[PDB]
Amino acid sequence: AFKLPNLPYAYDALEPYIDQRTMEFHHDKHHNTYVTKLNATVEGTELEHQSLADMIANLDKVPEAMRMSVRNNGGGHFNHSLFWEILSPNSEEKGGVIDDIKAQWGTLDEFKNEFANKATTLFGSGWTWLVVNDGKLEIVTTPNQDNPLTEGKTPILGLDVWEHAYYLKYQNKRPDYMTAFWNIVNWKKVDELYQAAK
Amino acid sequence: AFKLPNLPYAYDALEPYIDQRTMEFHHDKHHNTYVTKLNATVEGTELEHQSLADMIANLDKVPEAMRMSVRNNGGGHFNHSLFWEILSPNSEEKGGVIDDIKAQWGTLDEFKNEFANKATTLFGSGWTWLVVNDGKLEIVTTPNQDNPLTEGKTPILGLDVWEHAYYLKYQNKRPDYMTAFWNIVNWKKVDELYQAAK
Ligand SMILES: [Mn+2]
Ligand SMILES: [Mn+2]
């Protein structure tokens, strides 16, 4: 069975960038619901012993009756699990991934400007991702709980821009949430995922 | 130009079903943003005097370069405009539309149960609608700001299930928001839109 992972930090560790109350709802309610529904779909099937990353990457091979729930609930579990691991109370812009971002975008600010533009223009619910595509870095968005793995791209950083991720503190001000996020990126984790994928 | 319509009631008129703070953000920020961006797209173009119902029903005829903004921001203006008008602090379950709902679904409760199931299973951002389709009533969902007019169905009642519509009071408990909504439906306005469409 899939399990709700513990947060790597206290619920208030990301203040004042993400509020404690949002971390509690987001993890204990939203993410938990995706795990519950994913397990209800795969329990007693071949997919109960398939890796989450493999079923997301190969969603087209998931049996038709199960595919929407694996896409939505499996995507929810995969995306939130990644999200908690790429946040940290002490974000420092260090690691090979920063050199390779600078190499691709010229400056870290040019990278952040593209990421923020894509995150702020995403219409409805979804995610903004930094991915590795055949050894090259790209920023992409996905709707709802869709994940770039399904399109053959490995995610190493994601921002959740579902309104539940930011509404209690920021309400409509998604751009202020985006600005806050740079203060709490776990670049140690992003670099680990990059070095494994590149 | 398109204009942000005034609410037909005080911002606190729908308490304790929808909180005043949500009415303020939802109307004064979210709806206003759709009006601003729709006007930025259409002002000074050959669409600057076209009605919004006509453009949404005929998105294919909207020029490719303006279509996403008309769909998303035009949808946002159309949808929220309808929404404010079908809420009321003085809801009474009577009218031709209520009689015809009871005739079609058997009971009003069976209608509400279907509507609630569609509203609570809608994945991501969107709306739940009561529509007229060739003189018959149907419940349909749309994603984001899409509208059933594009598919040739006239909307007479909509529930906004974007998270901004309910997160401040209800957080993840979308079903409690759906329960609250029945207490504030303007069945007189719904009946007007029904008589005009059936
Ligand atoms: Mn989320
Ligand atoms: Mn809305």
Residue numbers in the entry:
A (entry chain B), B (entry chain A): 2 to 199
Mind quoting what the paper says about this structure?
SODs detoxify superoxide, a reactive oxygen radical produced by aerobic metabolism and by the mammalian immune system in response to infection. We recently established that a Mn/Fe SOD from the bacterium Staphylococcus aureus exhibits equal activity with either manganese or iron. In addition to the camSOD (SodM), S. aureus also possesses a second, manganese-dependent SOD (SodA). All members of the Mn/Fe SOD family are related in sequence, exhibit identical protein folds, and coordinate their metal ion using identical ligands, making it unclear why some enzymes absolutely require manganese for catalysis (MnSOD), while others require iron (FeSOD), and still others show metal cofactor flexibility (camSOD).
Remarkably, the chemical differences between the sidechains of these residues are minor, with Gly (MnSOD) and Leu (camSOD) at position 159, and Leu (MnSOD) and Phe (camSOD) at position 160. Conversely, the camSOD double mutant (Leu159Gly-Phe160Leu) had greater activity with manganese and reduced activity with iron relative to the wild type or the single mutant (camSOD Leu159Gly). This shift in camSOD metal preference resulted in a highly manganese-specific enzyme (CR = 0.016). Cumulatively, these results demonstrate that just two mutations in the secondary coordination sphere largely interconvert the metal specificity of camSOD and MnSOD. The camSOD triple mutant (Ile19Phe-Leu159Gly-Phe160Leu) had increased activity with both metals relative to the double mutant (camSOD Leu159Gly-Phe160Leu). These studies demonstrate that positions 159 and 160 are important in regulating the reactivity of the metal cofactor. Strikingly, mutations at these positions produced profound effects on metal specificity, yet did so with essentially no changes to the protein backbone structure, at least within the resolution of the crystal structures. Altogether, the spectroscopic data indicate that the two wild-type S. aureus SODs and the two double mutants differ in their manganese redox properties. The auto-oxidation data and dithionite reduction data both suggest that the two wild-type SODs have different reduction potentials. These differences are inverted in the double mutants in both assays, which correlates with the inversion of manganese-dependent activity in these variants. The double mutation in MnSOD resulted in an altered electronic structure and re-tuning of the manganese reduction potential to more closely match that of camSOD and more catalytically active with iron, whereas the camSOD mutations altered reduction potential to make it more similar to MnSOD and more catalytically active with manganese.
